[PDB]
Design a protein around this ligand. Structure first.
Ligand SMILES: Nc1ncc2ccc(-c3cnn[nH]3)cc2n1
Length: 173
């Protein structure tokens, strides 16, 4: 079916959470007519909701902070779907504060997941993928678990003060 069956739930959720946290969010949905198999439609809402909540809570900064940082005052959250060959690609993008990669590394060292000696040459993907480790810092492990139950993949791109883009890829069947 069309992914609108999932996406149409989100403006109310986004608006309620933004209100609760006294933030202003410009929420844009694209590609809502993208069709995919019912099994995906039935399961993908929960992970997407988690990612949207992360963007509103942890990503987009309060207006006053954005102004102080010389950013546009209202944060933008874009949820998109598209076909790419045999895959459907779903992206959740915010222009908030980004994920703090140094914080991740420090936590990974604390937890014994990496030796300090290996931190300097870690790739960006290797750093951000620590967020999918169970217990790391209801977590992102559960997002990845659902995506993988759908034979999908997930990746994160993020830069300090720029924002965060989470990409889910799903197969045709
Ligand atoms: N969209 C967005 N923006 C900033 C974030 C900051 C931290 C986290 C996170 C930490 N531990 N698990 N997730 C997720 C974020 N997601």
């Amino acid at each position: 079916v069309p992914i609108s069956f999932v996406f149409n739930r989100f403006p109310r959720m986004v608006r309620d959470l933004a209100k609760k946290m006294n933030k202003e969010v410009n929420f844009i949905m694209r590609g809502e007519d993208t069709e995919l198999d019912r099994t995906f439609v039935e399961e993908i809402g929960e992970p997407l909701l988690h990612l949207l909540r992360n963007a509103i809570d942890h990503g987009i900064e309060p207006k006053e902070e954005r102004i102080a940082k010389g950013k546009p005052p209202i944060g933008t959250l874009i949820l998109s779907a598209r076909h790419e060959g045999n895959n459907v690609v779903i992206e959740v993008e915010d222009d908030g504060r980004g994920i703090d990669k140094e914080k991740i590394i420090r936590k990974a060292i604390e937890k014994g997941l990496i030796d300090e000696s290996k931190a300097a040459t870690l790739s960006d993907q290797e750093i951000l993928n620590f967020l999918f480790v169970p217990g790391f810092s209801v977590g992102m492990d559960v997002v990845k678990n659902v995506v993988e139950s759908l034979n999908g993949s997930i990746s994160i791109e993020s830069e300090k003060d720029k924002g965060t883009k989470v990409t889910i890829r799903l197969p045709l069947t």
